Amino acid sequence: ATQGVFTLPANTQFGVTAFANSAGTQTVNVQVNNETVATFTGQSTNNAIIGSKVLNSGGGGKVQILVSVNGRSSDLVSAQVILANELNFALVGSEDSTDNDYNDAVVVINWPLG
Amino acid sequence: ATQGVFTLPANTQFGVTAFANSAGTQTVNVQVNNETVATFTGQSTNNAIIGSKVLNSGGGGKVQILVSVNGRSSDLVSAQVILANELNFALVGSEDSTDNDYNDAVVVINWPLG
Amino acid sequence: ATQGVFTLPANTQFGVTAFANSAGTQTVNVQVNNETVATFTGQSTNNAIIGSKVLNSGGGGKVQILVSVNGRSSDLVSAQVILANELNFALVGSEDSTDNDYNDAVVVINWPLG
Amino acid sequence: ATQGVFTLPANTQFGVTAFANSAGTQTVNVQVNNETVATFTGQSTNNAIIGSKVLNSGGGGKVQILVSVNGRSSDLVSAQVILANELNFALVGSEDSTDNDYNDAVVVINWPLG
C-alpha cells in the first residue's frame, strides 16, 4: 500500500517534526496538495530533531511525507491515531537499509494546534 | 483508567519529546521506574518543542508521563502504536481546561533509537 | 477524558462487534447521534462474540459505546486508528472490576464497508 | 515493509476474528510460529464475520496473517495498538483489487483474554 499519505481536514494548521536515527543523512520532504512546502536534511544516531514546522493543509487537505537518503527513497510505514476523538497523530517510520528498525527518519504530524 | 504509563522493554534507549499548545505554562515530568529523570517546562500556542531527551528504560521498563499546569494535574489520554512489528510510539495528550482539544501538552515517546 | 465517543463520516455504514472476557454479563449499548440503536448482552470468559451489527452513522456521525455490568457503568478506554489512509478502526476496552485487564467487554467499530 | 506479522507474549491465549467486504471470496490463513492453525473463508459485501477463534501464541509468540482470493495474495496493511498499557489489538487490512479500500478482508487479533 501507499504509505506516508494522510488526509487532514481542509485549511487546518498542523505540526510536522522529524527525528533521525541512522548513519545516513536523511532528507524529509513534506508535500501539501502535491507541492513541496518543507524540507529537512540532517543526520543523527541519537534521535536528534532535524526539523519542526507549522504548516497549513490547504484546500485539499492532502499531506504526503517522502524520505530519501543520498537520492534513494526509503521504505515507509505509517498510520494515523486519534485520541479523545480530537487529538490526531499521523506517524511515519522509514528504513534506508536492511536492519528493519524503521527509525532512520521518524516523522510525527500532529493537529489541532493552538 | 490510568493514562500515560507504558511498559518498555528493559534497559532500552528511548526518546521523549513534548510540544505545547495552550495559554498555560506546561510542566511535563518523565518518571522511569518511579524516579523523575526529566522535566520540561514551557508555554506556546504554536506547537513549540518544550523539551526532547534520550533516556534509558532501566530494569523495570516502566515509563510514566505526568503533565501539570499551574500546580494542577492535567487530564491525560494515551496509547501505544507499533508499526512494522518494530517501531514503537507511546503517545500522550493532555487537557488543562474545558475545551477538550487534549493538545495542551503533547508528548511522544519513540523507540528503538540508533 | 470521555472515552468511547467517535466521529464517523456522516451517513456512512459501519460495523460494530463486541467480545466478552469476564465473569459478569456485559451490556453493550451503541448510540448513534445520542440515541441507543443496539444493545448486546452476553457472558463469556473466552472472547465470545456477544453481538455484531451493521449500522448507519446518520447526519451527525456520532457513535458512542457504553458498557455496563448489572447496571453499573464500566470504565472505558478507546482510540481510533486509520490504516492506508482509508481503513478505520474505533476500539473500546472496558473494566468492570479491579484487575485492570480492560478486556471485560471489547468493542470494535470498522468502516468503510463494502 | 512486511505486514501482518506480530510478536505476542509467549504462551498466551488470543482471539482472531475476520470480516469480509468484497465481491471476491476471502481466504484468511493464521500461522502461529510458522504453522497454519486456522483458516477462515467466506464472501460478503456487508462485513460478515467469516471466522472467529481462540488460539495460543506458543513458545515463539509469532502470529502471521495471510490473505488470498482464489489463490492470489492480497496486499496487506497492519499495525498494533495498546490501550491502558494492557489491552492489545493487532489489526490487518487487505486489498484484492484496484480500489484501495483495504477492507476486503479485515482481521482483528486481541489479547489478553479471560
Ligand SMILES: Cc1cc(S(=O)(=O)NC[C@H]2O[C@@H](C)[C@@H](O)[C@@H](O)[C@@H]2O)c(C)s1
Ligand atoms: C552513509 C550511509 C550509510 C547507509 S546504510 O545503509 O548503512 N544505513 C544506515 C544505518 O545506520 C545504522 C547506524 C542504523 O541506524 C541502521 O538502522 C541504519 O539503517 C546509507 C543508506 S547512507
Ligand SMILES: Cc1cc(S(=O)(=O)NC[C@H]2O[C@@H](C)[C@@H](O)[C@@H](O)[C@@H]2O)c(C)s1
Ligand atoms: C494562564 C492559563 C490559562 C489557562 S486556561 O484554562 O485558560 N487553559 C488554556 C487554554 O488555552 C487556549 C489558548 C487553548 O489552547 C486551550 O486548548 C487551552 O486549554 C490555564 C490552565 S493557565
Ligand SMILES: Cc1cc(S(=O)(=O)NC[C@H]2O[C@@H](C)[C@@H](O)[C@@H](O)[C@@H]2O)c(C)s1
Ligand atoms: C459475576 C460477577 C463477577 C464480577 S467481578 O467484579 O468479579 N469482575 C469480573 C472479572 O471476571 C474475571 C474472570 C476477569 O475476566 C476479570 O477481568 C473481570 O473483571 C462482576 C463485576 S459480576
Ligand SMILES: Cc1cc(S(=O)(=O)NC[C@H]2O[C@@H](C)[C@@H](O)[C@@H](O)[C@@H]2O)c(C)s1
Ligand atoms: C480485478 C479483480 C476483481 C475482483 S472482484 O470482482 O472480486 N471484486 C473485488 C472488489 O469487490 C468490490 C465489491 C469492492 O468490495 C472492492 O473493494 C473489492 O476489491 C478481484 C478479487 S480481482
Ligand SMILES: [Ca+2]
Ligand atoms: Ca535502519
Ligand SMILES: [Ca+2]
Ligand atoms: Ca536506525
Ligand SMILES: [Ca+2]
Ligand atoms: Ca485545552
Ligand SMILES: [Ca+2]
Ligand atoms: Ca490547546
Ligand SMILES: [Ca+2]
Ligand atoms: Ca477486568
Ligand SMILES: [Ca+2]
Ligand atoms: Ca477480564
Ligand SMILES: [Ca+2]
Ligand atoms: Ca478493495
Ligand SMILES: [Ca+2]
Ligand atoms: Ca472492499
